[PDB]
Ligand binder design. Sequence first.
Ligand SMILES: *[C@@H]1[C@H](O)[C@@H](O)[C@H](O[C@H]2O[C@H](CO)[C@@H](O)[C@H](O)[C@H]2NC(C)=O)[C@@H](C(=O)O)[C@H]1O
Ligand SMILES: *[C@@H]1O[C@H](CO[C@@H]2O[C@@H](C)[C@@H](O)[C@@H](O)[C@@H]2O)[C@@H](O)[C@H](O)[C@H]1NC(C)=O
Ligand SMILES: *[C@@H]1O[C@H](CO)[C@@H](O)[C@H](O)[C@H]1NC(C)=O
Ligand SMILES: *[C@@H]1O[C@H](CO)[C@@H](O)[C@H](O)[C@H]1NC(C)=O
Ligand SMILES: *[C@@H]1O[C@H](CO)[C@@H](O)[C@H](O)[C@H]1NC(C)=O
Ligand SMILES: [Cl-]
Lengths: 74, 385
Amino acid sequence: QDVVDLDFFTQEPLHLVSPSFLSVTIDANLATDPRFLILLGSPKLRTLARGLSPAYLRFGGTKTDFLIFDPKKE
Amino acid sequence: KFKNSTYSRSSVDVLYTFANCSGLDLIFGLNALLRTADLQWNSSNAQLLLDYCSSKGYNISWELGNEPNSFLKKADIFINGSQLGEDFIQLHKLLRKSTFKNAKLYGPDVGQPRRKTAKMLKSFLKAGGEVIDSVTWHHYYLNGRTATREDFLNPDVLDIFISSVQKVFQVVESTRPGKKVWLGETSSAYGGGAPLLSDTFAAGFMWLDKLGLSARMGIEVVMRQVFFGAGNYHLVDENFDPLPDYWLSLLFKKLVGTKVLMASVQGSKRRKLRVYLHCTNTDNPRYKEGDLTLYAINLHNVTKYLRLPYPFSNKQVDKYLLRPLGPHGLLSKSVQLNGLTLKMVDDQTLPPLMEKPLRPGSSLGLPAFSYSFFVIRNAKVAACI
Ligand SMILES: *[C@@H]1[C@H](O)[C@@H](O)[C@H](O[C@H]2O[C@H](CO)[C@@H](O)[C@H](O)[C@H]2NC(C)=O)[C@@H](C(=O)O)[C@H]1O
Ligand SMILES: *[C@@H]1O[C@H](CO[C@@H]2O[C@@H](C)[C@@H](O)[C@@H](O)[C@@H]2O)[C@@H](O)[C@H](O)[C@H]1NC(C)=O
Ligand SMILES: *[C@@H]1O[C@H](CO)[C@@H](O)[C@H](O)[C@H]1NC(C)=O
Ligand SMILES: *[C@@H]1O[C@H](CO)[C@@H](O)[C@H](O)[C@H]1NC(C)=O
Ligand SMILES: *[C@@H]1O[C@H](CO)[C@@H](O)[C@H](O)[C@H]1NC(C)=O
Ligand SMILES: [Cl-]
């Protein structure tokens, strides 16, 4: 009758994940968008980001290996 | 195809401010294709960045390279795992001499473990494994160009992830036993996602199953590609509006604890009804020490009714059932929690995620092509402290 019985193992934790287990990325590509400052300055986007704290934010992507830091650029 | 670009102090500040103001821990990927005469990593550009970040008192973690397995394709440069390991040792020495000498270092951000990628990861961990804090690798189920709706609902596609995970742990157990293993970049489909699929309710089967299996199999951290950006696997669209996977991600974070347990369905057929069990998140103000969080995926085309085992059969259960808002069904970009559409209250305010208490002793209803969380109140599981 579409009824299903579950078995649970509850003796001990099998693993411990990070409190940051569910983390996110921002692609390296986004830093090549002329609007990078406007986008990451968005209050609405920051509210949604705070919702996922605690988390890691990985800044990385294919473009990681094609980006050069220029300390003289404005 | 890929050309060098520069970024500014301004760009670094934008990124850091966004992480800091959002309560996120920034990990910054350094360019590994900056190479000396004899293909050693040239750390001179990274030095300029570490110095700048040090001067601004930025608390940042580091990576070096992205998918070094595909450098030959992307840049007609081959770096072997042994050399990359040496490059990571060189970065570890720079970090140790910087203001944040205890900064963390992750890598090598390899793709999923095909023969050549497994070889690179093994030689990398032999050479450089001592200086990384976690091993990072990447996974996608599908090519976004060719992915179908049926693929997003196919338990045979979901199950392929289990073999990828087993293959990565075989390499790590052979080289750096007990080193933490992270998914450093992961999604439904690569090449920016599957149009009309990666940004829908249908994407949630893959995402929730990946989280469940990652936690069950020993992965400590899963990094979702992408929070926001060019690719319809984003959690947040171009209008800064949350997609169904954002809401699923937020519910997961509210209900699921750090201590991983195990659930399974009695009977041979275990493909289409997928079940996961953790301690309940202790930070959730509704629940108490000992409570359980079950989450389940139903890929059957009929409702299933789940029965909890002794001694949990008569406990008060809170249901958190996600279903799409019509008319586009699983291809909807809107989701309801227990029949209420999830939407921002305003640009500053997330909505409450309201439980549906079930009749104590009732079976847990899971509609066709849906996913749900169930919190078992007063479970009093000692393992959950
Ligand atoms: C993992 C890569 O690190 C990541 O950068 C890829 O996504 C970006 O690059 C691809 C092409 O390499 C583009 O199709 C995506 O639109 C990019 N995404 C964003 C968010 O800018 C990613 C992927 O293939 O989707 C992985 O290769
Ligand atoms: C529904 O799915 C069928 C295969 O699934 C099995 O049968 C259904 C009724 C449920 O009992 C499920 O739990 C079983 O595993 C298909 O044979 C059938 O074609 C499907 N119907 C449609 C409309 O796609
Ligand atoms: C990127 O820069 C390096 C050194 O700064 C250079 O040798 C290389 O050719 C550049 N690559 C591309 C693809 O433009
Ligand atoms: C590393 O790169 C810098 C700047 O591109 C260059 O001037 C320096 O001499 C390079 N070092 C080696 C050893 O090639
Ligand atoms: C790895 O690469 C370097 C060249 O950068 C080479 O000297 C070394 O022999 C290579 N290692 C193996 C195992 O081939
Ligand atoms: Cl190699």
